[PDB]
UniProtKB/Swiss-Prot annotation:
It comes from Mus musculus. It is a lipid-anchor. It is found in: Golgi apparatus membrane; Golgi apparatus, cis-Golgi network; Preautophagosomal structure membrane. This is Ras-related protein Rab-33B. One of its GO terms (biological process) is protein localization to Golgi apparatus. GTP binds at residues 12-17, 31, 34, 60, 117-118, 120, 148-149. Its main location: Golgi.
Length: 165
């Protein structure tokens, strides 16, 4: 069984790093703005069932994503919205991504979660947890704060995606 999870959010929030961290088990140290359609896969076992989790690493840049959104939303099973904890603007963008999702989803059942990334940059954090939690609550989504680069030692990125499956 294929479980398609799309990862949506502003350019530079770390979507490519999160998806690569989950699928490959390590941080990608060479990344550039994602262009077009990229996805990566990982075979997992949940409760005895072998499942192929397929993470769609969407483009944040308008030029590269504009004609791709119906590919992103084709046969989607879950949605992960990402902001950068060090960039308040990326958090302010979220209502726009959430509305795009609303317009493209048919099934009212599909899980959506909110992820703040780059929590390792403690000194540079701009989005307080309480603010993000209040917003997540308003949209009936759970909130996770994590790091694609460093939080693993806090037991977080794997758990966030696994729990969706
Ligand atoms: N310190 C830190 N840097 C991170 C983390 N995640 C990503 N980065 C860095 O943030 C930058 C953007 O990462 P990237 O995954 O390419 O972003 P993106 O959301 O895929 N961008 P695009 O939408 O344009 O493809 C990179 O320089 C990457 O090294 C993180 O958890 N911690
Ligand atoms: Mg990318």
């Amino acid at each position: 069984r294929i479980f398609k999870i799309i990862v949506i959010g502003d350019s530079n929030v770390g979507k490519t790093c999160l998806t690569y961290r989950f699928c490959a088990g390590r941080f990608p140290d060479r990344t550039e703005a994602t262009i077009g359609v990229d996805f990566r896969e990982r075979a997992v076992d949940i409760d005895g069932e072998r499942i192929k989790i397929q993470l769609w690493d969407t483009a944040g840049q308008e030029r590269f994503r504009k004609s791709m959104v119906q590919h992103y939303y084709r046969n989607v099973h879950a949605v992960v919205f990402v902001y950068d904890m060090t960039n308040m603007a990326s958090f302010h963008s979220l209502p726009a991504w959430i509305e795009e999702c609303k317009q493209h989803l048919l099934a009212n059942d599909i899980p959506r979660i909110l992820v703040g990334n780059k929590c390792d940059l403690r000194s540079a954090i701009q989005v307080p947890t309480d603010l993000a939690q209040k917003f997540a609550d308003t949209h009936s989504m759970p909130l996770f704060e994590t790091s694609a680069k460093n939080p693993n030692d806090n037991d977080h990125v794997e758990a966030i995606f696994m729990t969706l499956a």
